[PDB]
Amino acid sequence: PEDFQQHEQIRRKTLKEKAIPKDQRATTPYMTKYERARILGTRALQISMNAPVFVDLEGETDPLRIAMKELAEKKIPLVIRRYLPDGSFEDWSVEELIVD
Template sequence: MTEALLDIYRRAVSQRLSRFELARVIGARALQLSMGAPPLIDVSNIEVRDPVYIATLELINGLLPMSILRPRETGEYELVPVSKLVTPEVKRYLSSILESWNISRRV
């Protein structure tokens, strides 16, 4: 690959959450919730009280005050807020997971 293509690829990848980062963020927040942290959304009208479900809803709504530490090419690290990395595609993907979660609970 040429240097220009690599630069385009790096910029595109650096602006999205990887599947591993996504799992880590949801898992970390779910652990906080299971240890007694207050939810950042109103859970009074939510049928499912699972911490993973609530953490996913918080992520979709952009309420998580978390950042990801990412290495730069210079060897330094930068903190990137999770809310900047959640794209509409990720929100649709997570919403479809939550919908299937609700359907499976009804069966």
């Protein structure tokens, strides 16, 4: 009924009160060794499950090193959600971050 809907609209109002908007983001512009070791992790676990690839892979069977080839050329469709400890967050992309 709507006791799901009254249970749903509270969450999407809660989930909208925690996204810090893009003109007001206040964390680092860097990829702080923990995004980088996990973005390369999860993307390598997508190419092993037939994700669409967007680079001239050059006989590189190793599924981890394929993601590095797309990391240094910025073809990754990921978005990092960084939880500030009250529950608020800043959905950084992978383009707008700056690698080490």
